[PDB]
């Protein structure tokens, strides 16, 4: 949605391809952004109840991200963990 700042270091760092940004890994990263801008939602809005429009999958997309990636690979559970916001 932004533009030039949509690649300053979003996928280019996560997506290692012109189409590896839609992967599940690059998304888990976008799961963090939608998180920070999720609390500042009603802190500016002023006419659009029914918030949280499916804006929950983002939280569940980290509280158990290992149940998917780490599950289909124990090694993959030790790379984006330091570049997303999993444990420490």
From Swiss-Prot:
InterPro entries: Ribosomal_uS15, Ribosomal_uS15_bac-type, uS15_NS1_RNA-bd_sf. Coiled coil: none annotated. SMART domains: Ribosomal_S15. One of its GO terms (cellular component) is cytosolic small ribosomal subunit. It comes from the Bacteria. It holds the Pfam family Ribosomal_S15. Keywords: Ribonucleoprotein, Ribosomal protein, RNA-binding, rRNA-binding. Gene3D superfamilies: 6.10.250.3130, S15/NS1, RNA-binding (1.10.287.10). GO terms for molecular function: rRNA binding; structural constituent of ribosome. GO terms for biological process: translation. One of the primary rRNA binding proteins, it binds directly to 16S rRNA where it helps nucleate assembly of the platform of the 30S subunit by binding and bridging several RNA helices of the 16S rRNA. Part of the 30S ribosomal subunit. Forms a bridge to the 50S subunit in the 70S ribosome, contacting the 23S rRNA. PANTHER family: RIBOSOMAL PROTEIN S15, BACTERIAL AND ORGANELLAR (PTHR23321), SMALL RIBOSOMAL SUBUNIT PROTEIN US15M (PTHR23321:SF26). Belongs to the universal ribosomal protein uS15 family. This is Small ribosomal subunit protein uS15. It comes from Thermus thermophilus.
């Amino acid at each position: 949605p932004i533009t030039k700042e949509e690649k300053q270091k979003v996928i280019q760092e996560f997506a290692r391809f012109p189409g590896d940004t839609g992967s599940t890994e690059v998304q888990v990263a976008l799961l963090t952004l939608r998180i920070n801008r999720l609390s500042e939602h009603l802190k500016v809005h002023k006419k659009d109840h029914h918030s949280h429009r499916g804006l929950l999958m983002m939280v569940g997309q980290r509280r158990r991200l290992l149940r998917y990636l780490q599950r289909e690979d124990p090694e993959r559970y030790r790379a984006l963990i330091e570049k997303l916001g999993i444990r420490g």
